[PDB]
Amino acid sequence: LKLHDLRPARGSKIARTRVGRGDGSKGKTAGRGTKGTRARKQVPVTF
RNA sequence: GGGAUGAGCUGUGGGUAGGGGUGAAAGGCCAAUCAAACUCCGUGAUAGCUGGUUCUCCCCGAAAUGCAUUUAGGUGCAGC
Numbered sequence: 001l002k003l004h005d006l007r008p009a010r011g012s013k014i015a016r017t018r019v020g021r022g023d024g025s026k027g028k029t030a031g032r033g034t035k036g037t038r039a040r041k042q043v044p045v046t047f
Numbered sequence: 048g049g050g051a052u053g054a055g056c057u058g059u060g061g062g063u064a065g066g067g068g069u070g071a072a073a074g075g076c077c078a079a080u081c082a083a084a085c086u087c088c089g090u091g092a093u094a095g096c097u098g099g100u101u102c103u104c105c106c107c108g109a110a111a112u113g114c115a116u117u118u119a120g121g122u123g124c125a126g127c
């Protein structure tokens with residue numbers, strides 16, 4: 001009853017990771033680290 | 048300082064247009080840009096390259112080696 005009583009099951013929904021938002025999280029390279037290809041592009045699986 | 052009746056200078060009007068013109072030839076000039084003008088479009092071209100990437104705390108925590116490579120400042124797999 002009463003729409004203000006519905007809550008999702010625990011573990012069903014978890015917040016997305018925002019990756020370029022300061023030093024306390026994935027800071028500036030956003031997990032990329034490198035200076036090479038992988039810092040700006042993807043490497044094809046076939047290469 | 049050079050020429051200053053000459054292969055002179057100059058006005059007005061016109062013509063040659065981009066891998067094309069024009070050049071007593073320097074790759075010179077073609078609207079302050081020229082070893083291929085400019086504008087718009089393809090187009091948010093591509094760049095193994097440079098730069099940038101924004102709030103917090105808790106736990107753990109490297110590598111800079113091997114192999115191969117049109118490879119050596121890149122990448123794949125292993126190692127961590």
Ligand SMILES: [Mg+2]
Nearest residue numbers: 022023027028
């Ligand atoms: Mg910073």
Ligand SMILES: [Mg+2]
Nearest residue numbers: 030031032033
């Ligand atoms: Mg990562």
Ligand SMILES: [Mg+2]
Nearest residue numbers: 034035036038
């Ligand atoms: Mg890398």
Ligand SMILES: [Mg+2]
Nearest residue numbers: 034035036120
């Ligand atoms: Mg490096």
Ligand SMILES: [Mg+2]
Nearest residue numbers: 029034035098
């Ligand atoms: Mg950087």
Ligand SMILES: [Mg+2]
Nearest residue numbers: 043044045046
């Ligand atoms: Mg593909």
Ligand SMILES: [Mg+2]
Nearest residue numbers: 060061062063
């Ligand atoms: Mg004319």
Ligand SMILES: [Mg+2]
Nearest residue numbers: 072073074082
């Ligand atoms: Mg020459």
Ligand SMILES: [Mg+2]
Nearest residue numbers: 076078079080
């Ligand atoms: Mg000019």
Ligand SMILES: [Mg+2]
Nearest residue numbers: 065066083084
């Ligand atoms: Mg041209």
Ligand SMILES: [Mg+2]
Nearest residue numbers: 065066082083
């Ligand atoms: Mg060309």
Ligand SMILES: [Mg+2]
Nearest residue numbers: 089090091092
């Ligand atoms: Mg296209």
Ligand SMILES: [Mg+2]
Nearest residue numbers: 106107108109
């Ligand atoms: Mg520790």
